[PDB]
Design a binder for this molecule. Structure first.
Ligand SMILES: *[C@@H]1O[C@H](CO)[C@@H](O[C@@H]2O[C@H](CO)[C@@H](O[C@@H]3O[C@H](CO)[C@@H](O)[C@H](O)[C@@H]3O)[C@H](O)[C@H]2NC(C)=O)[C@H](O)[C@H]1NC(C)=O
Lengths: 145, 307, 62, 163, 48
C-alpha cells in the first residue's frame, strides 16, 4: 500500500460497476466498455436542459453507483400559479428562452400590474408578480341632480 | 501520454476547513512517487457583466454573470452573488442555478438610500469553489452627458523639454460620431501635491481660455511663467509632484456643458522611468538575443517617441 | 459576429430594425446595449467585458 | 423611450438567428455587445455600433434631481443637420408636480444649416418623486416629441439615524 | 477602539476586519442612548 511499484501489479482492474443508469433527456458524459470500482462518471443533460443536483456518480461500495440526487430540467420558464384569473396568451408546454409573454384579465375588467414577462433569465420570469387585481368598481355615482 | 484527472469537488472531506494539499501519485510497473501538489478552490472563471458600469439611486443593477470551467466550457454550478458596499460591508447574497451556462440574478434594486461609491460584486460559486472573480460598479447622482470630451498631450508631464511651454489637445465629439461644431472652453490649472487627494487651488492669473471648433482646440501652458509668477516652485529641480488640468467645454450655441480632468501632468526630475517588456533575463550563446524596454510617464501612458 | 441586417450609416426614432448573429456553431448568445454617453461619465471606465482575453490570461500560473 | 440601456437578453442560436426591435428615442450611438457561450469558449463580438440620428431634433439639459420649492433653468437645444437654415419653435408640458412661468407659442427664432440653437425653460418642481415632461419641437419638416423624466427631493439638511 | 465613559466591549479581538463590527454598552449603573455597535471602515477608523 505504501510502495506498490516494488511488487508485481495487475494494473488493469478486475472489479467493476455495471454500466451507469441512463437519465430522461440526458446522458453519461463519459463512455467505455467497463467502469472499475471507484471510477467516476459525470452526467450532462441534453440540448435545452440543466442538470439539477449533483452530476457526479461514484462507483461506490457494494458495486452500486451511489449516483446521488440528480434531475434533468428543460430550461423553460414553466409558468407558476397565475394571478386572479389573469391569463398568459402565448401558452406553450415550455416557454422558450427570451420569449416575451403578454398577460391580461377578461375583457372590460380593471386589470392591475405589468403587461409582460420575458424569460431572459431562462428559469425565472425577468419581472414577475405573485398577485394583482383583475377587476374593480367600474360604475360611479350617477344623476346627482 | 496524458490522463485528464480532477479533485472531484464534492468528494473532498471538507467541512469547516479546506483541504489545502493533495498527493499526486503514479504507480507504474517500474516506479511510484507521491508529491504534495497544492489544490485551489479557485476553479475556472467568473466574469461579471453589469448592464452599465454606472448607476444612480432608484435603479436596479441587473447583473449577469458568466461561469466557465478552466476548459472554458460553461460550468453549470449554483452560484451566489455577494454585493459589497463602498464601505467594505456585505449588503446582499442572492443565489441562482447556472442553468444555461450563464447566470442571471434578480436585479438587486439599489437599497433605499445607498452609500455612493464603488460597490463590488464578489461572485461566489456556492458549494466547493472559491473562484471569486470580482467586478465593480459605481453609484453616482448623474444625467448622461451630451458629448464626449478628451485631452491629449504627447508627454503627460512637465519637465526640461517643455516647462517653458507645455502643449496639449482639447477635443470633443457628439455620441452620434460627429465633431462638436463650436464650444467655448475654460482650462483650469492647479498645483497638486499628489494623484491621491488634495484641496489645492488654481492659478489666479495664467489661467487659460481656448476655442473648440470642428471638434478640436489647442492649449499651451507656459508652466514656468505661471509657476515663477504665482508659486513656490521657482526651479525645475524642486519636484516629483503634479499639475491638475481640468477642462470645461460649453457648446457655443447648444446649452450643454461637459467637463473632464487629468491629474496626470507630473512635475518631474526624472520623467522617463523604464521597464523591460518581454525580456526573459536568460541568455542563449549562438542565437541573437533580443531586449525590449518601455518608458512610463506619471498616471502612466507609454510616452511614444523617446531616445 | 454581429450586424444589423438593414445595413445603414444611420437610423431614426421609433425605427424597427433587425439584428443577426452569425455564429460558427450551435451557441448561446447574450445581447446587451448601452448609450455611449454611459462611458462619457465614468472617466477611464473599461468596457464591462473589456480584455476578457487578458482576465482569462491571469489564470496562467507562470 | 429615452433609455441608458435595454436589449438585456439571452438566446440559443442556430448558425444564424435574427431578432427585431424598435430603436429608442435616445439619439446616440447604441453600441451593442453580444457575448457567445458554447463548448469552445466565451466570445465577445466586435461591438456593433448603430446611430439614432435625424436631420432635425430637439434635446433638453434637465438635471438629475432638483430641490422641491427652488426654481431652476432647464436648457434646451435644436440640432439642424439639414443643408440650410430654418425657423423653429419649442413647447413644454408636464404633470402638476411642477409649476412654471413659461405658460404653455415662440417668437419663432432661426437655426442655421449644419448648426445648433440654445433655448431656456424656467420651472419650480413643486412635488417629489418622478415627473414626466414632454418637450416638443412644433416645427416644419423634421419634428420630434421628447418625453423626459425628472427626480425631485426635499428642501432641508440630510441626517441619517440608527438603532 | 477604547470604549467610551463607563463602557465595555462585548466581543473582543486583536484585529477586526474591514466591515466587521464590535458591540459596546455602559456598565451596571448605566444605559446607552443611541446605536451601540461600531464598524471598521476601509481606512482603519471606527467612526464612533
Ligand atoms: C407626453 O407624451 C406622451 C408619449 O409618451 C403622451 O402619452 C400618450 O398619451 C396618449 C393619450 O393619453 C396615449 O394615447 C393612447 O392611445 C391608446 C390606443 O390604444 C389608448 O389605448 C390609450 O388609452 C391612449 O388613449 C399614448 O399612448 C401615450 N403615449 C405613451 C406611450 O405614453 C402624453 O400624453 C404627453 N404628455 C403630456 C404633456 O400630457
Amino acid at each position: 500500500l505504501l510502495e506498490p511499484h516494488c511488487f508485481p501489479l495487475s494494473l488493469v482492474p478486475t472489479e467493476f460497476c455495471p454500466s451507469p443508469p441512463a437519465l430522461k433527456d440526458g446522458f453519461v458524459q463519459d463512455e467505455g466498455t467497463m467502469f472499475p470500482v471507484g471510477k467516476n462518471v459525470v452526467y450532462t443533460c441534453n440540448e435545452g436542459y440543466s442538470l439539477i443536483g449533483n452530476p457526479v456518480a461514484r462507483c461506490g461500495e457494494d458495486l452500486r453507483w451511489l449516483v446521488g440526487e440528480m434531475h434533468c430540467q428543460k430550461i423553460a420558464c414553466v409558468l407558476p400559479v397565475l394571478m386572479d384569473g389573469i391569463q398568459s396568451h402565448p401558452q406553450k408546454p415550455f416557454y422558450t428562452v427570451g420569449e416575451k409573454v403578454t398577460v391580461s384579465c377578461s375583457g372590460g375588467m380593471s386589470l392591475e400590474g405589468p403587461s409582460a414577462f420575458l424569460c431572459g433569465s431562462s428559469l425565472k420570469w425577468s419581472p414577475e408578480m405573485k398577485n394583482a387585481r383583475c377587476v374593480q368598481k367600474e360604475n360611479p355615482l350617477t344623476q346627482a341632480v | 501520454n496524458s490522463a485528464i484527472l480532477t479533485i472531484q469537488p464534492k468528494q473532498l472531506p471538507g467541512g469547516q476547513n479546506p483541504v489545502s494539499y493533495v498527493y499526486l501519485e503514479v504507480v507504474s510497473k517500474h516506479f511510484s512517487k507521491s508529491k504534495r501538489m497544492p489544490i485551489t478552490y479557485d476553479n475556472g472563471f467568473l466574469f461579471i457583466h453589469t448592464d452599465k458600469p454606472v448607476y444612480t439611486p432608484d435603479q436596479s443593477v441587473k447583473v449577469r454573470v458568466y461561469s466557465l470551467n478552466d476548459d472554458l466550457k460553461p460550468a453549470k454550478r449554483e452560484t451566489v452573488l455577494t454585493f459589497i458596499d463602498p464601505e467594505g460591508s456585505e449588503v446582499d447574497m442572492v443565489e441562482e442555478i447556472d442553468h444555461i451556462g450563464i447566470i442571471s440574478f434578480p436585479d438587486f434594486k439599489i437599497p433605499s438610500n445607498p452609500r455612493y461609491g464603488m460597490w463590488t460584486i464578489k461572485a461566489k460559486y456556492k458549494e466547493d469553489f472559491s473562484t471569486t472573480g470580482t467586478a465593480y460598479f459605481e453609484v453616482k447622482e448623474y444625467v448622461l452627458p451630451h458629448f464626449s470630451v478628451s485631452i491629449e498631450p504627447e508627454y503627460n508631464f512637465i519637465g526640461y523639454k517643455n516647462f517653458k511651454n507645455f502643449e496639449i489637445t482639447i477635443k470633443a465629439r457628439y455620441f452620434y460620431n460627429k465633431v462638436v461644431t463650436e464650444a467655448d472652453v475654460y482650462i483650469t490649472f492647479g498645483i497638486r501635491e499628489d494623484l491621491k487627494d488634495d484641496q489645492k487651488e488654481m492659478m489666479q492669473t495664467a489661467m487659460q481660455n481656448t476655442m473648440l471648433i470642428n471638434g478640436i482646440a489647442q492649449v499651451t501652458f507656459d508652466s514656468e511663467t505661471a509657476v515663477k509668477e504665482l508659486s513656490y516652485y521657482s526651479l525645475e529641480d524642486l519636484n516629483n509632484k503634479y499639475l491638475y488640468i481640468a477642462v470645461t467645454v460649453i457648446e457655443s450655441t447648444g446649452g450643454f456643458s461637459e467637463e473632464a480632468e487629468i491629474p496626470g501632468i507630473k512635475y518631474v526630475l526624472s520623467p522617463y522611468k523604464l521597464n523591460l517588456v518581454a525580456t526573459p533575463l536568460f541568455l542563449k550563446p549562438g542565437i541573437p538575443y533580443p531586449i525590449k524596454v518601455q518608458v512610463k510617464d506619471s498616471l502612466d501612458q507609454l510616452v511614444g517617441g523617446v531616445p | 459576429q454581429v450586424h444589423l441586417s438593414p445595413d445603414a450609416d444611420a437610423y431614426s426614432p421609433g425605427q424597427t430594425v433587425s439584428l443577426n448573429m452569425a455564429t460558427g456553431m450551435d451557441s448561446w448568445v447574450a445581447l446587451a446595449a448601452v448609450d455611449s454617453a454611459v462611458y462619457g461619465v465614468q472617466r477611464g471606465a473599461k468596457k464591462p467585458l473589456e480584455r476578457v482575453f487578458q482576465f482569462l490570461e491571469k489564470s496562467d500560473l507562470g | 423611450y429615452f433609455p441608458e440601456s435595454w436589449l438585456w437578453e439571452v438566446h440559443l442560436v442556430p448558425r444564424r438567428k435574427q431578432l427585431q426591435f424598435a430603436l429608442p428615442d435616445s439619439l446616440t450611438t447604441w453600441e451593442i455587445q453580444g457575448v457567445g457561450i458554447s463548448n469552445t469558449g466565451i466570445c465577445v463580438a466586435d461591438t456593433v455600433k448603430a446611430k439614432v440620428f435625424k436631420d432635425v431634433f430637439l434635446e433638453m439639459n434637465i438635471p438629475y434631481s432638483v430641490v422641491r420649492g427652488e426654481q431652476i433653468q432647464l436648457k434646451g437645444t435644436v440640432y439642424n443637420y439639414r443643408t440650410s437654415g430654418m425657423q423653429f419653435c419649442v413647447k413644454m408640458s408636464a404633470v402638476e408636480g411642477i409649476c412654471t412661468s413659461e405658460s404653455p407659442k415662440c417668437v419663432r427664432q432661426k437655426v442655421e444649416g449644419s448648426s445648433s440653437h440654445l433655448v431656456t425653460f424656467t420651472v419650480l418642481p413643486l412635488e417629489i418623486g418622478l415627473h414626466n415632461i414632454n418637450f416638443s419641437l412644433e416645427t416644419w419638416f423634421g419634428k420630434e416629441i421628447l418625453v423626459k423624466t425628472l427626480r425631485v427631493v426635499p428642501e432641508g439638511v440630510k441626517r441619517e439615524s440608527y438603532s | 477602539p477604547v470604549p467610551p465613559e463607563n463602557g465595555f466591549i462585548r466581543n473582543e479581538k486583536q484585529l477586526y476586519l474591514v466591515g466587521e463590527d464590535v458591540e459596546i454598552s455602559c456598565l451596571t449603573g448605566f444605559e446607552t442612548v443611541g446605536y451601540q455597535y461600531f464598524r471598521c471602515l476601509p481606512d482603519g477608523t471606527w467612526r464612533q
